[PDB]
A paper describes a structure:
The structure of the AB-domain fragment, which was solved by molecular replacement to 1.45 Å resolution, reveals that despite a lack of overall sequence identity the A domain is structurally very similar to the B domain. The structure of the segment comprising the A and B domains was solved to 1.45 Å resolution by molecular replacement using the B domain (residues 149–250) as the search model. The structure of the AB module includes residues 57–250, approximately half of the extramembrane part of LdtMt2, and 309 water molecules. Each domain in the model contains a bound sulfate ion located on the protein surface. In domain A the sulfate is anchored to the protein through interactions with Asn95, Asn97, Arg99 and Arg122, whereas in the B domain the ligand forms hydrogen bonds to the side chains of Tyr201, Arg209 and Arg211. A structural classification of immunoglobulin-like β-­sandwich domains defined four subclasses, s-type, h-type, c-type and v-­type, based on strand connectivity and topology. Both immunoglobulin-like domains of LdtMt2 belong to the c-type Ig fold, with strand orders a–b–e–d and c–­f–g in the two antiparallel β-sheets. The similarity between the A and B domains is reflected in the Cα r.m.s.d. of 2.7 Å based on 85 aligned residues. The sequence identity derived from structural alignment of the two domains is 12% which does not provide strong evidence for gene duplication. The domain interface accounts for 350 Å2 of buried surface area including 13 and ten buried residues from the A and B domains, respectively. The domain interface is formed by the loops connecting β-strands β1 and β2 and β-­strands β5 and β6 in domain A and the loop connecting β-strands β6 and β7 in domain B. The two domains are connected by a short linker Ala149-His150 forming hydrogen bonds to the main chain of the B-­domain residues involved in the interface (Gly236 and Phe237).
Residue numbers in the entry: 57 to 250
The structure:
Amino acid sequence: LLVPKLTASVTDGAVGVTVDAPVSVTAADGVLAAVTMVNDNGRPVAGRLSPDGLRWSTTEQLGYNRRYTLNATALGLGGAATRQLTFQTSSPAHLTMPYVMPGDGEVVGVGEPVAIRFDENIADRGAAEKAIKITTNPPVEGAFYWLNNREVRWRPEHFWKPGTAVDVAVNTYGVDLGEGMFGEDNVQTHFTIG
């Protein structure tokens, strides 16, 4: 007969915790009976408990420069377990907001690149690229190229084909884009090649 086991995806006393991923808690040999997370001013963080009670996860954006307190209780045939932990999230030197072109909902020509322009210097171009997901349909191969320290573009080898959906997810919220420059938020754009 085992006592329930709680496992969180963050450690107690962690610092610099990145806010580009949710925080989770799992139970084994039992189910989650209560999970709460609050910030340093006592504001609850939204989360979702799976219907089977085995996993809870945050469902909204954690803030920069915050201390979060997580409490969980699991209950099983073998008794109860509780855990509390506290951690601190990333403290950016600066924030940068990206702007994507073409604009959301636009219909554009066969020579138009995807362009992602950040409003501050990007010292880690590789980190910025990794945070950007391009979807094409019909699918075509393409690649990123930087114009300068602020603007990265993406295109196929030659021209686009008319009737192509292009989806651009710029997910740099929580990502250190070099020298403590973090994404201010995520951006989502979808357009069509006419």
